[PDB]
Design a binder for this molecule. Sequence first.
Ligand SMILES: CCC(=O)Nc1nnc(S(N)(=O)=O)s1
Ligand SMILES: [Zn+2]
Length: 257
Amino acid sequence: HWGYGKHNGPEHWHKDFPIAKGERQSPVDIDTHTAKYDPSLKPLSVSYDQATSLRILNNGHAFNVEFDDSQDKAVLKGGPLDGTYRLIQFHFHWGSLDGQGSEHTVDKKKYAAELHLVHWNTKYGDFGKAVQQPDGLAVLGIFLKVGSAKPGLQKVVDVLDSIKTKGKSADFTNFDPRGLLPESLDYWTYPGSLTTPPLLECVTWIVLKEPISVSSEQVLKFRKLNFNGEGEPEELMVDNWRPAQPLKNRQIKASFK
Ligand SMILES: CCC(=O)Nc1nnc(S(N)(=O)=O)s1
Ligand SMILES: [Zn+2]
């Protein structure tokens, strides 16, 4: 089964998921000098006030904070998007060291981690149908650098001990994802894919320019999670990031001058 190891990592995924070599794969390097400002791009509308988190899950590749997506409670609109995209979950990708961990890179710079807030286009009814459509998902990507702690992340950090191993979940209600955003909503946007198998080419990527700061202690706690299940030899959940893929026939657009 696929993962991030020597023998099942990103360079192997194409054998089971041939779209791994497709025309709109993610992540990509964001060449900031080649991205074109698009004055027609609109401000992102992030409406998370009524978000309903439910549960946090170690799935053996990351941890997901899941939300009730049965109503328009936490929605992303505007920007490059047409219509309404409902938040279903967020998760992160991180490194074994502070110098790597992000999936997208910025002028080849790797951040310590990257947060993905995953939304599906409500015109397709459910996430499973949305992933079959070129405009099915909108993923909001937020870079993490190591410095001052992010107070809004701490509630996530402190539950990780209870979901150390693959398959473990914990009740995780009343989490406000607004506490994970940076001050600015300036962004780059491009058409891409899921960055994990099945790598479906269904994502409008919206990657925020301003990283959030998290503390070394916060990210160290990410690195104490396990890829393995309970009762298996410990494999630290680190370096669960896919590297940058060829941009091919795509333009990255910037919301800001
Ligand atoms: C609801 C299920 C889900 O969100 N699956 C995803 N698989 N890869 C994602 S990524 N790293 O592109 O945001 S999201
Ligand atoms: Zn992700």
